[PDB]
Every structure is written in C-alpha cells, then in structure tokens.
C-alpha cells in the first residue's frame, strides 16, 4: 500500500544533547500501528500504538535524552495489522541531529548585521576547531550546508554563506560538524540578528 505517513519533529529536528524530542507520525490514512526506523550509527525500530483523533491517525514517538545512537535519518512506517505488520511505504526522511557536542563557532556578518534593502549580505562561520563543514540555521529550522576551508594562517576553519540581496531579516545561527559523524553537530554560535531597514 503506497500511502505514506508523515513524520514531524516537535520541537525541531535539531535537539540539544541530553534533551528529549517528540517524533510524530501522522496521516489522513487510518493506521492502527506505527513503526519508527532509524539509519545511522545504531539502527533500531520502535513501535507505538496508533491514536485516532478526528480523521487523523497519529503517534508521538519519544526519543529520550539525546545521545549519539539516537541521531540519524528517521523514516516512519505505518500499519493497521499487528501480527502481520503489513508495512506501508516509508515516510519522507527526517534527519534528527544532536547538538552541543563540540565548541561553538563564530558567526559574523559582512557588511554587517543591519543592512539596507537590496544590499548583499554574506555570513561567515569561523572556529578554531577543524569542522569539516558548517551549517547555517535561520529561526532554528533551516539547513544550509557548505564545506569548510582548512587551517588558515589565523588558525581558523571558515565557511562563507552568501545570503544574497537582502529582502528578509532573521536570526541566524551557526553549527559545526565533522564528516565522519554527519548527524553530530556542535554548540550553536551566538545568534546573529540580520535586520533589513
């Protein structure tokens, strides 16, 4: 049955270390049982019985105090049978990552945090740690990944994020990661407010 469930993450897919995140499988299709599968360092499948509200079948899976094994690509399967466990098509993937495992990076704005409309803004992620890649986040829920430049004479590993001509303003944060552990990120950079006047 190629009817896929939907997978959400409350509060968000970026969960700090040793904190709890609620992964919700919901669908207009009536499902009596739900299966949550993770791909990563430690692959596991979780089951929760389905709850029925209005015409929506939903289950709030609980991913406990965040640790390395609980991070990865999550896909939710659906079922109405239990002993057969006839599995639906996989949900659209959701990458749950753990933050706060490394030192925070430094986020800077050139020309500056506050800028006039139409003026190009470029945000720079820098850290003395050897982060192989940096992640830019606006309002918490965002994903812009660029590879990082290596050891500068300054000793900083840096990546430049071109925001382009400025029409919107938001609160941007930076995260650092290593290529070996893709779903394990660093502490958030000190938030940088981009304002367009």
């Amino acid at each position, epitope marked *: 049955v190629h009817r896929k469930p939907s997978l959400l993450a409350h509060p968000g897919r970026l969960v700090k270390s040793e904190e*709890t995140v609620i992964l919700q499988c919901w669908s207009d299709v009536r499902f009596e049982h739900f*299966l949550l*599968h*993770r791909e990563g*360092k*430690f*692959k*596991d*499948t*979780l*089951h929760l019985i389905g709850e029925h509200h209005d015409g929506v079948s939903k289950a709030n899976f*609980s*991913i*406990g*105090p965040m*640790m*390395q*094994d*609980l991070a990865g690509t999550y896909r939710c399967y659906g079922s109405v049978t239990h*002993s057969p*466990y006839q*599995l639906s098509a996989p949900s659209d993937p959701l990458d749950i990552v753990i933050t706060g495992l490394y030192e925070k990076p430094s986020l800077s704005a050139q020309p500056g945090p506050t800028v006039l409309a139409g003026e190009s803004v470029t945000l720079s992620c820098s850290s003395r740690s050897s982060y192989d890649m940096y992640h830019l986040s606006r309002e918490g829920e965002a994903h812009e990944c660029r590879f990082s430049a290596g050891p500068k004479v300054n000793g900083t590993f840096q990546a430049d994020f071109p925001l382009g001509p400025a029409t919107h303003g938001g609160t941007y944060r930076c995260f650092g990661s290593f290529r070996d552990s893709p779903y394990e990120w660093s502490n958030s950079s000190d938030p940088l407010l981009v304002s367009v006047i």
Partner: antibody, heavy 123, light 108 residues
Framework: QVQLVQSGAEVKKPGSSVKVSCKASGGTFSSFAISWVRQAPGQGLEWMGGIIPIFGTANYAQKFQGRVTITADESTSTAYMELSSLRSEDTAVYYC????????????????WGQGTLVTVSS | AIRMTQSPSSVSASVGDRVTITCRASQGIGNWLAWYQQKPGRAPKLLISTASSLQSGVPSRFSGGGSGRGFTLTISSLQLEDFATYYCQQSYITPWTFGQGTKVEIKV
C-alpha cells in the same frame, strides 16, 4: 516466556567459515532485537553486533566487522551469525541474546540468553 | 569506544562477607549500566539494569549504585550460590562494552 536455543559445537580449521543459529520461541521474532556476544578464553564478554527488530538489518562492531555477518530468517524464527575467516583468536564460546529496550529508544541490557555455542580452531 | 574498567579482578571470599565490585566508565553513561552474573558453563544472567533496578527472581542482597562514571555492585551477605564471575556492561552508546569481570571465588 521468551527462550533461545543455539546450534551445536563446531571444530573448524584455520581459514574456514562457521555459521551458528539462534532459534527463538515465546514471542514474535520481529519484535526481538537479537545480539551476538563472544566469550574468549582469556577475554571477557564482547558485543559483536545485533539485528534490528523488524527489518533484520544488523548493527556491527568495528572489531568484528568484515569477518562477521549477522542475518535472520523470519520463517524459521532463527538468527544466524557467520565468521568468514577462522583464526586461533576466534576460538571462543559465542552467545546470542535478546536486548530489551525501554522508553526513549534506549536499551537497558540482555535479559534472555542462549545456551552458547563452542567454536574451536584446529589445535 | 566507551571503556569499562572493572575492579577488583578477583575476590577470595567466604560465605557471609560483604563484597563490593566497582565499574568505572571512560565517559558518562548516565544510569545505563547493567550487572551480569555468569556461573561456570552456563550463560550470563542479567541481575541489575539501570544501575539500581533489580530483575525479578534476584535476591535483595544484590544491590547496585552509581551514576555518570562511577558504579558499584554490593552483595551484602554472600551465599554459596553467589560464587561466580560478575560483569558490568554499558548500554549508552552502540559499541556496547563489558567490563573485564570480577571473579568471586571461594577462599582456600
């Protein structure tokens, strides 16, 4: 009452391949997460890897990866573990066990164990 | 990756003396430590989960304590059925590692 039975003892020459079975009763095989633990003569207990509950994919340990393949057959309600290249260090008692989990995606230990299987390299 | 250091390696004990076994973790594992008992020939048996929670059918003399990186297993009054090798195992992160084991032996 979940119970696990294992294959018999095996005497194999160096470089051979051994396969051990783990038959489960008392519950649905799909619900179980079966891991494999090795007890060497001098060494203690080492987690080699285990199957994921429903799908049957196996998490492995780096030390044993490349020579160990862990599989499962839902029809037989049996889990399998295969050592590719047998060396004198591989000689040990190999156990299968069910890992029990609680809330939050955590597992807390191996509550049910098999009787163990003795593999022995050539003297 | 997480290394478990178990001490002591061996205990020469008689029936009735308190035996304390310690297990130190390389990094913080929270309360996610399990204590096992393996008698000769038979398979390991789970005695305590979540550092302190005892399984059913386990006598009250077995007690588990600790959190973070330091853990202890205390048998207040040893009995003849309690002479075996004891292991600690972490369940926090995928490379699940056991301790080297504590061999509680009958005193010569």
């Amino acid at each position: 009452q979940v119970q696990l039975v294992q294959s018999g003892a095996e005497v194999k020459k160096p470089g051979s391949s051994v396969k051990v079975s783990c038959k489960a009763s008392g519950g649905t095989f799909s619900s179980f997460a079966i891991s494999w633990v090795r007890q060497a003569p001098g060494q203690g207990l080492e987690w080699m890897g285990g199957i994921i509950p429903i799908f049957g994919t196996a998490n492995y340990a780096q030390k044993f990866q490349g020579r160990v393949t862990i599989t499962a057959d839902e029809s037989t309600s049996t889990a399998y573990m295969e050592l590719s290249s047998l060396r004198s260090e591989d000689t040990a008692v190999y156990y299968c066990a069910r890992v029990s989990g609680t809330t939050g995606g955590y597992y807390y230990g191996m509550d049910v164990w098999g009787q163990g299987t003795l593999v022995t390299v050539s003297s | 990756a997480i290394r478990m250091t178990q001490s002591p390696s061996s205990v020469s004990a008689s029936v009735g003396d308190r035996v304390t076994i310690t297990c130190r973790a390389s990094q913080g594992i929270g309360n996610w430590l399990a204590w096992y008992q393996q008698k000769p020939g038979r398979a390991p048996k789970l005695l305590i989960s979540t550092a302190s929670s005892l399984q059913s059918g386990v006598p009250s003399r077995f007690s588990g304590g600790g959190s973070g990186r330091g853990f202890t297993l205390t048998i207040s009054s040893l009995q003849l059925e309690d002479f075996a090798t004891y292991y600690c195992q972490q369940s926090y992160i995928t490379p699940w590692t056991f301790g080297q084991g504590t061999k509680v032996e009958i005193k010569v």
